[PDB]
Design a protein around this ligand. Structure first.
Ligand SMILES: NC(=O)c1ccc[n+]([C@@H]2O[C@H](COP(=O)([O-])OP(=O)(O)OC[C@H]3O[C@@H](n4cnc5c(N)ncnc54)[C@H](OP(=O)(O)O)[C@@H]3O)[C@@H](O)[C@H]2O)c1
Ligand SMILES: NC(=O)c1ccc[n+]([C@@H]2O[C@H](COP(=O)([O-])OP(=O)(O)OC[C@H]3O[C@@H](n4cnc5c(N)ncnc54)[C@H](OP(=O)(O)O)[C@@H]3O)[C@@H](O)[C@H]2O)c1
Lengths: 173, 198
């Protein structure tokens, strides 16, 4: 990008992924001049990992600057962000890494050397380490699961392909 | 539908249309058992908006894939300032056997409720005010007006996705910031190709 090789790392459970996440990634990419945003579904932080992976693949497929990595899922065991960053650094060693996730998740992970590996960006609804406010994050995976539980439509909260994956695999019923 | 023939009427300026609007229409359709939602881009405002045809076309682009959404020209072709009374009369004439459910933003519905002659609107349609998070009615006259209304005549529904606003979209466009995932791809491209907020 304009500020050198930079890579977003969008950590999350994504159960399900939705337009709030996609908007957040898109915004964070623009603000920090990122070349790409790798979505990394957590292995073990909840639907099976293959579902969360495929929903993320379906959702990001059409964007040339988004991709999905299985590094946390394929590692096995609990998911640590130091391992995610190590793996992604090994793949893109000439890029500066920008780890992006929900601000609340980011408030907990800091319970040290993580800052040697990456810059951290916390996203939330409004109200080194940077906080970015995203109005579309009023959409949440919790509402999405409840709507699916109650048989209410998910249209326009997420890509059609993800609306259909959730319905076809009966994910939250 | 499950409670009879019902048509959603989704009234707005739509400058631009966004996923908020589309989520709102989809949710109200489900909540009120509506067979169809007709989007009605507004004509002249009561303020500078993009030309009516742009707003018409973004709305067509955005609703095309949905079998239950359509777009009407009745307000853009009437001319003068848009009165929802005229919208409803026109749509009533066109869909004589449907109960109409006029749906718009809660703040706009309050303005409609402030207009002299509001009573005759409820002879033509039921009303749904869609609000975003943090919405509060701060009008004691309008609050008392709600008590004049029959059961199910007016319903308020909070839609988290209406945090996305047309005002924020126009600002993002003005600031060369991406609109991806706030609105359908076709609408992002329309805005860019017609250079709407430059
Ligand atoms: N020890 C560790 O290294 C450790 C510990 C905890 C978390 N983490 C990491 O933190 C990340 C987040 O974990 P999680 O999703 O399981 O947290 P979570 O507890 O499921 O969610 C916390 C909040 O963050 C939001 N959120 C999560 N991921 C997001 C994203 N990428 N973009 C925007 N909002 C997002 C959530 O909204 P939605 O529900 O709508 O997504 C929710 O409001 C993962 O990469 C995980 O590996 C690491
Ligand atoms: N006296 C009258 O009969 C009278 C007077 C005024 C308006 N109206 C009618 O009221 C409707 C709204 O007018 P407008 O768009 O010009 O109002 P507006 O002032 O531009 O909108 C006020 C608020 O309502 C939201 N909103 C508008 N239409 C919406 C919709 N269909 N669904 C969800 N949120 C919506 C707006 O969000 P966004 O910016 O994101 O859309 C904004 O937060 C139109 O059909 C208009 O003809 C009638």
């Amino acid at each position: 990008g304009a500020m050198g090789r930079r890579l977003g790392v969008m950590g999350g459970t994504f159960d399900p992924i939705h337009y709030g996440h996609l908007v957040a990634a898109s915004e964070v990419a623009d603000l920090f001049d990122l070349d790409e945003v790798v979505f990394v579904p957590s292995g073990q932080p909840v639907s099976a990992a293959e579902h969360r992976y495929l929903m993320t693949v379906i959702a990001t497929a059409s964007n040339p600057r988004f991709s999905v990595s299985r590094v946390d899922i394929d590692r096995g065991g609990p998911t640590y962000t130091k391992d995610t960053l190590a793996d992604l650094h090994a793949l893109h060693p000439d890029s500066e890494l920008y780890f992006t996730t929900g601000a609340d998740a980011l408030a907990s992970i800091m319970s040290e050397e993580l800052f040697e590996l990456a810059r951290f960006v916390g996203v939330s609804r409004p109200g080194a380490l940077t906080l970015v406010e995203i109005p579309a994050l009023a959409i949440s995976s919790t509402d999405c699961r409840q709507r699916a539980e109650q048989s209410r439509p998910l249209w326009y909260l997420m890509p059609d392909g993800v609306v259909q994956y959730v319905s076809k695999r009966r994910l939250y019923t």
